[PDB]
Symmetry: C3
Subunit: 185 residues, 3 copies
Amino acid sequence: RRTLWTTPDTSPNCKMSTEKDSKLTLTLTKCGSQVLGNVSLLAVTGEYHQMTATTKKDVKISLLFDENGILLPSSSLSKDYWNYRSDDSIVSQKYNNAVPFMPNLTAYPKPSAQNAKNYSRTKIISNVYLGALTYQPVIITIAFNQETENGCAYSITFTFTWQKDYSAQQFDVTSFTFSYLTQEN
Amino acid sequence: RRTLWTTPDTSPNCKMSTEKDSKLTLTLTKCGSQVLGNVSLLAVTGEYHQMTATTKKDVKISLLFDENGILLPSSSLSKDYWNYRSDDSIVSQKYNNAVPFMPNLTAYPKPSAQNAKNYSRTKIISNVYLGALTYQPVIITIAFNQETENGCAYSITFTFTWQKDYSAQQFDVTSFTFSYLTQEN
Amino acid sequence: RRTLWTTPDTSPNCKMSTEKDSKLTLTLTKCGSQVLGNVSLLAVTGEYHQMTATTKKDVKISLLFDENGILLPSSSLSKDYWNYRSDDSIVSQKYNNAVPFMPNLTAYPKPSAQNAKNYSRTKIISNVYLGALTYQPVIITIAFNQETENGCAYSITFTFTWQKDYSAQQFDVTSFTFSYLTQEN
Ligand SMILES: CC(=O)N[C@H]1[C@H]([C@H](O)[C@H](O)CO)O[C@@](O)(C(=O)O)C[C@@H]1O
Ligand SMILES: CC(=O)N[C@H]1[C@H]([C@H](O)[C@H](O)CO)O[C@@](O)(C(=O)O)C[C@@H]1O
Ligand SMILES: CC(=O)N[C@H]1[C@H]([C@H](O)[C@H](O)CO)O[C@@](O)(C(=O)O)C[C@@H]1O
């Protein structure tokens, strides 16, 4: 069908600090040339569930994909928790081609180490809000195809950075809508 | 078809302070698993048409829906002004099922009074701009399924909050794009 | 098909200061009642490729369309670089009707000179980031049908304004997602 997602439940599927300490809620809906994306992140256990003054205010969630658009196991997100939608769940077969969901490699080329400075269009930068409190911004940076980790063909990364002291709080952010150009259609 | 909307005209349809003092422009377009939403709000009469120093800088527009996805009459938005699109208008039959437009209850569960602190992913927080002037932010908070008013099955609320003194101005904001996960597909 | 775009390559197609000094990357995907848009801008040559302290911190990119939704040659964007998608390129026939991609004239009416103050819903205002650096905001203002230049039927303009001193840098911004109501469906 035309949605890849994590499912909308709260079962931990992602690494912020340690394995499966967090729930990434990510939905990618194919709209022709573009994917319409929706993302949020919640810490369920570990450091980011009850932050301290020294907790690093920078968290990168990496989704690395192979040439078939299939998630690599070195990704932050667990493979078992990511697939095509069926009802409120995911399909049973694990290895379904997803090239039409991948970010376009002409729009968003892989880095070349010389320039060490790619096109800014490879990123989206905005704010989401910790605890859904309007005075608690967290910068979200979405980057397309900027990883080289583990021979990936494509990548989507979500980086959350902040400056304010959110010690004693649970990391949880508002939802963010975005789009990107796809490899196929 | 695949759009629910208010129509794009300027005929008042909504309550900010009193009945039908304002035009909510809202379009919900079904894109599979997600709705693509577009919203703006204009005060046509009453307090928010010519604000004062004491006008409350917090306005909640509530859309409450029943189990069929049909707007409840206790909503801020008038029933008569909300339906499936036809041309630049709305269809003639008033009571059309709209469950596929409703926010997903697994992604966006109704509150349980104990925790008194739901998932932050149930909200979207950003800024729109009063008068389309870049120095006049208004915080927009969109919340999914967080109301319990009048036995609603689903809800979408738009809250506009601000801190700057917009006395002597008409409330009118720029358009805001968003998406959310739907109950069905 | 259902995408109008510039293509995702880096071949200059647009005027910031002089002809074809910049690459506008713009994709418009038809989703029923709405277009899902994605935009970014890069200066390849001229003033905006290496800004100075006096470079004007205001750049308007104008797309003017005729009654058939076809770009007028007085637009900032070159005609030769804009058309319906095929693969990663554009179709061969140059003059394809695109009314279903045009911004809705009821939602976004042309100005009437008296009020000299249209509906704020005709604009979207947010920030994108120069160099994809989180401390370098650039205000993006998208306006629908607000031009009268050259007898246009429709218009979409992208204005980039800023206040910080970005001297010695290349103008290049992060991607921005938006939507608008269309004339037809
Ligand atoms: C939605 C939004 O823009 N929130 C912003 C808030 C609000 O403007 C003020 O709390 C009240 O207006 O101000 C900040 O300085 C803050 O609190 O950290 C930045 C933050 O991004
Ligand atoms: C689009 C945007 O971000 N606008 C912001 C403006 C501009 O940054 C400055 O007016 C000029 O740069 O600054 C604010 O402090 C303001 O005016 O209230 C917050 C507001 O949200
Ligand atoms: C994504 C975002 O909101 N960036 C904002 C940054 C960051 O908040 C701080 O650099 C660190 O938090 O602050 C600004 O004052 C700035 O740098 O110009 C406004 C800018 O829009």
